[PDB]
Amino acid sequence: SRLLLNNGAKMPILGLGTWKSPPGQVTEAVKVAIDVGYRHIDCAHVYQNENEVGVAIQEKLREQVVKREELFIVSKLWCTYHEKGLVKGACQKTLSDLKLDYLDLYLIHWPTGFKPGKEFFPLDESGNVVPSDTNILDTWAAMEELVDEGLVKAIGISNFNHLQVEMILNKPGLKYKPAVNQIECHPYLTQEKLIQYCQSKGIVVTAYSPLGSPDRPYAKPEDPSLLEDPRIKAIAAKHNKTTAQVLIRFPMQRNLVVIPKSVTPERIAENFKVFDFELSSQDMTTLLSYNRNWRVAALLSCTSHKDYPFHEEF
Ligand SMILES: NC(=O)c1ccc[n+]([C@@H]2O[C@H](COP(=O)([O-])OP(=O)(O)OC[C@H]3O[C@@H](n4cnc5c(N)ncnc54)[C@H](OP(=O)(O)O)[C@@H]3O)[C@@H](O)[C@H]2O)c1
Numbered sequence: 001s002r003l004l005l006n007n008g009a010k011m012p013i014l015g016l017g018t019w020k021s022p023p024g025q026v027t028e029a030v031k032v033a034i035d036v037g038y039r040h041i042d043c044a045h046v047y048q049n050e051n052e053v054g055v056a057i058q059e060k061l062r063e064q065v066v067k068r069e070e071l072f073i074v075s076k077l078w079c080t081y082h083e084k085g086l087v088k089g090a091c092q093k094t095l096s097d098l099k100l101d102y103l104d105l106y107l108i109h110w111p112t113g114f115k116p117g118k119e120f121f122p123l124d125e126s127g128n129v130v131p132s133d134t135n136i137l138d139t140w141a142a143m144e145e146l147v148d149e150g151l152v153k154a155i156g157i158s159n160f161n162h163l164q165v166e167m168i169l170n171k172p173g174l175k176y177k178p179a180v181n182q183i184e185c186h187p188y189l190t191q192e193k194l195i196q197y198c199q200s201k202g203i204v205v206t207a208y209s210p211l212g213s214p215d216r217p218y219a220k221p222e223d224p225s226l227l228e229d230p231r232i233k234a235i236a237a238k239h240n241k242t243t244a245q246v247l248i249r250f251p252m253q254r255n256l257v258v259i260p261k262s263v264t265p266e267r268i269a270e271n272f273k274v275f276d277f278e279l280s281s282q283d284m285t286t287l288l289s290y291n292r293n294w295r296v297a298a299l300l301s302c303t304s305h306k307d308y309p310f311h312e313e314f
Pocket residue numbers: 016017018019020042043109158159182183207208209210211212213214215227244245259260261262263264267268270271296297
């Protein structure tokens with residue numbers, strides 16, 4: 001239900017994603033989720049809706065539905081704020097849009113540093129993405145003491161390959177360990193080498209894009225669907241659950257936290273009814289056997305960034 005983090009705080013094994021969640025519909029999404037019984041909201045600045053996602057949390061707090069410490073609000077530092085001077089300001093902007101006084105987990109969104117400016121994705125005239133010469137260990141020391149101003153309860157990372165995680169681990173003075181490396185992970189990109197490396201290290205795995213990110217802007221020629229896989233669909237009807245409900249239960253039982261995005265009030269509901277049933281060893285190893293090494297989000301414009309997390313095997 002809640003996983004213990006290496007900072008002593010417990011983290012709800014189930015939460016709501018807001019990437020691709022419109023400002024108009026992401027206030028009312030969160031409010032309904034919370035009502036339904038969600039206590040974990042996954043936010044990011046680059047997602048552009050945190051204000052509207054923070055109007056949602058202030059109504060439930062006014063309304064006495066939840067106390068602040070019942071919730072577990074998560075956010076991530078975008079690539080253009082990677083310099084020591086920019087980091088506190090970016091947590092502070094997130095902190096005022098959401099309208100909270102502390103975050104519980106603050107994550108480093110990507111390993112890749114970009115040029116600081118108004119553009120989330122800086123480009124040159126050759127069209128390619130412009131990098132900051134800052135590194136991970138520098139950026140980590142700016143986050144390590146957001147903790148010391150008492151702005152965040154915990155700090156983490158998103159999309160680091162095992163080697164990247166290691167850098168922080170053997171950094172002299174490493175005052176604060178990574179509580180959480182959040183990553184993509186579904187039946188087609190099963191991720192068990194990173195998942196079974198982070199876990200030996202006390203780092204918690206959040207699996208994002210758990211349903212296939214069915215609405216991320218890319219669609220290819222003939223992309224694969226999980227929410228519509230025949231094999232995955234049988235496994236569900238056995239459990240009389242839905243293919244969503246099965247694709248959300250899979251991470252959970254890998255001891256992973258799961259953040260399925262929804263702006264639909266009856267889906268937000270469905271996604272919550274995942275607590276009352278087990279998948280079998282057959283199901284979990286079948287589901288597992290389905291991996292195809294395919295990712296939704298591969299950051300294709302930082303392929304050549306010195307800090308591109310995806311050239312390493314895991
Ligand atoms: N850390 C990172 O760098 C990063 C990157 C990507 C994702 N993530 C996080 O992980 C969450 C992962 O979600 P994602 O955005 O990649 O998408 P997702 O969970 O794979 O799925 C979202 C999509 O699936 C639909 N959906 C929701 N419930 C469903 C249901 N029960 N039945 C059918 N379809 C369902 C949604 O529709 P409706 O909205 O129409 O209901 C939306 O189209 C994100 O929102 C975000 O918070 C983090």
